[PDB]
């Protein structure tokens, strides 16, 4: 009894009324429209497709007003420890302009109460990128785990990095996002917190052990993570509070804006903007495909 069950989120309607779904400005300042679950479900945003729970953006219509048109949904439901698993079939590809994540949010003013990127990334990006954002006086150590460290300071506004770049691992496997994790058919993303620290596991389809999905996991028995996040350089307990789970797809915005135009989408427009706005066709792949999401706690 490591870990057992406490919120299985089913699929479709179900799942979906586990969430609330943010319709304000994006925070991000992306060039993105977030909508509410009713005009989701009228413009085939959210779903079910075969049994799995559909989340993706409007890739048919000429953007106006805030932005193309997508979804934040943020879980009713927190959770302080525990351990998150997440089975997707699809996730939002490695399309120009796109900013999708599937990440948690503390309570309270950020960064105060933590953040946990587990899957992110920008425009055409390989690679999975998975971030703490916290207040200062966090670092974690450079072993345990099979990615590659990026930057060591989780502060977000660490001296010596970018701005909120946090602390990042960046994966080494090219099926862990986008294009290529599609083209595998997905895989799954555990994360688990303790007081101790974060760690994520990135299992592409095929190679998740048997007990992944099942009541009780045991990450004591697992391979190594792709991203590990401890040390005593932080005060794990104290830097993160309840979390919140969101799904979300933005697009342009402080980070994929901002590095349009050094990246290989450059040659598709002069700017994010425009090409997002006039290209609906291009986000077609932009979407999440979620066989289960499940978590355990201690
Ligand atoms: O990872 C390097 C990249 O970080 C960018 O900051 C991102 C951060 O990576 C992401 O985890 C967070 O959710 O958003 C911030 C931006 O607000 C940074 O902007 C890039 O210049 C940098 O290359
Ligand atoms: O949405 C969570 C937080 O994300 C950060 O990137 C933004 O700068 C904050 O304004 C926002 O509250």
Redesign the pocket.
Known sequence: EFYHLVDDYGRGNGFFDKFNFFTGDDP?HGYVDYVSRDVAAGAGLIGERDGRTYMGVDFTNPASGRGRRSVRLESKNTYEHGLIVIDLAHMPGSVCGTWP?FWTLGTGDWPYGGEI?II?GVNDNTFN?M?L?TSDGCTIDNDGFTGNL?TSNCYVYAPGQ?????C?IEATDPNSYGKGFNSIGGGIYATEITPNGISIWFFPRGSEPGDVLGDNPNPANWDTPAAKFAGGGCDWEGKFNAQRLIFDVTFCG??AG??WGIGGCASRAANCVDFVRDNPSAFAESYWLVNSLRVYAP
């Open positions: 991000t994540a990127d992110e990128h971030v954002h990026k970018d701005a909120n770049a946090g990042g402080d980070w901002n590095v």
